Symmetry: D2
Subunit: 170 residues, 4 copies
Amino acid sequence: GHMARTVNLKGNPVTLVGPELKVGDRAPEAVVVTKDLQEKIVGGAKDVVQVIITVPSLDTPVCETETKKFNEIMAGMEGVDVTVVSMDLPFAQKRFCESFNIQNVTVASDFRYRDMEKYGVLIGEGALKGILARAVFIIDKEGKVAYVQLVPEITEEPNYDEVVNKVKEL
Amino acid sequence: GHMARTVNLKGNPVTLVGPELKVGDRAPEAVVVTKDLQEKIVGGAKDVVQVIITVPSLDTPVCETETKKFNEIMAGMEGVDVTVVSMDLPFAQKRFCESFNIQNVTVASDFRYRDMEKYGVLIGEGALKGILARAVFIIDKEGKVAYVQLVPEITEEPNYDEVVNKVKEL
Amino acid sequence: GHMARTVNLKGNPVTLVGPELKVGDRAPEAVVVTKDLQEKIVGGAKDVVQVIITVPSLDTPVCETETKKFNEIMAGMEGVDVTVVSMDLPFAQKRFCESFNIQNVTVASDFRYRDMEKYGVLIGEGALKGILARAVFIIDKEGKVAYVQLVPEITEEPNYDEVVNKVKELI
Amino acid sequence: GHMARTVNLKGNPVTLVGPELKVGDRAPEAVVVTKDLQEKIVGGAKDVVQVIITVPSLDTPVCETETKKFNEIMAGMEGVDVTVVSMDLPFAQKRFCESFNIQNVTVASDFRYRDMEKYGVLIGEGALKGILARAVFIIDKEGKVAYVQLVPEITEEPNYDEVVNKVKEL
């Protein structure tokens, strides 16, 4: 589960589109769109540690809960940029941020270029084909993947402490 | 009444991706996803008249107003299948239909294959690049485009009467 | 035969992007581009039996051999429309036809819309990710998939006779 | 060099997909595929000058002429990576390199992710919709666009000398 080419959806296997990203690989750059329709680049090397969180949709229960959690857990932490990315259009994401006070993390949409396929989390089969799997990536300042967590079951939340602890050592 | 290769967004023109469709052309089939995540084909020939309405996003003011309008005016009509298509994910469209009781028309997402590019309504530049322009197509039972309407200004509502009158003739 | 969600590339398994099609399913329409840059629609229901052959690239020995062989065995056959589809740009397909004198079958490119993903043959991993796997589909006049053959290994050629016999059976 | 939102095909205008890149902008990264099927990253900041040359297809007369030409004037020039990019599959580019001794420039395909859309050269209408317009980009060591040249007539060769003179200044 931690990292693989397949995940489960309600117990049924779902294959992901490659490539499978491994620790040590350069983090691909993803040109995503924020709620104000501006584009931003996640991935690559930055002067800060990056935490990229992918979710199927902010308009779904689990994803909503997860984003709220990371928004609270990463709050106040300096030296790190946290971005929750999904295929939701910026308009849905804007609505999400208006309904909930999200200010410790940035939500972004990958609808325009679908660059997250480069992270190996694009779902390749089933009802959710074309949507992103639930995963977490931590990128160091050298722009290398330092940590990967692919949640084995899409309907399940990730291990939050494993993520925070890795960010701390970086 | 006639398609074009550009539309305005607050007065400023934005180019559309081709091809430009014209009455008489075969209606391309678009494989879209409904709110229950089932795939549906719009376009092509069906034993019913098809009204395809494209909008930038149901999570925006005008599109919301437009969809509610068509839902009301198309209520009770037999022999016709009306579908509002956008790049919103099925999850957002699901939430839209739960907030406004939309039951006379169908809503579907073109996020998976982006087949509406085949209708010449995919926006190719500016802040809304990758989203669909506001338009209406009516397909006859033989699968041919019988009517087209491209709203000149994205922030404008379409001419509803013109659409209803043409559907009644088909 | 039966379709599958995986194929081997030089012995190594690679997953395909869904959905997986089966005999009886409606054949999805694919808007492809011919060597003259015109668009052709394959799939759906037509008053003719359709044979859609997918290959990784006409610029590789195996695909060239497969295409020449199908061009030969389908020569002069009435009531059928055979199309070889790949992600090659039309410019490469044109050069191919010119060099191999392909006149009995049509070659077309899926580069513009990649509609063949709807047939479950888009490779989802490995060196050929984004390319089409080697397969054969036969669509009946009703627009239904009447036959399917997914070559288990990309470097291998398909079973030609099996296809020909089925086409004849469908008339 | 000059950039625009349209190019002509035998004097007839064809619109390009946005965005328009300008000198001073950061050079977007494009994940392309070489003839050996390995992935290479063009754009972004590297320790060398980058010359990115986009063409409709190497399987066309003009494109072949231009490639051989650039492979001539950029010879022996150290500290500069030259890549010719197109939507041709790697297999055609491999065949191209085996037919013409090209050892001063690298050819790569953008078929997998179509990242060159980020450079504003993706054609959006007409018979060539989906392939790249003819252009030349020069990226400095800081990863910024330092030069841009969009050939006004896609069927013609670009202005070679001004490209080589600019790379020297860098």
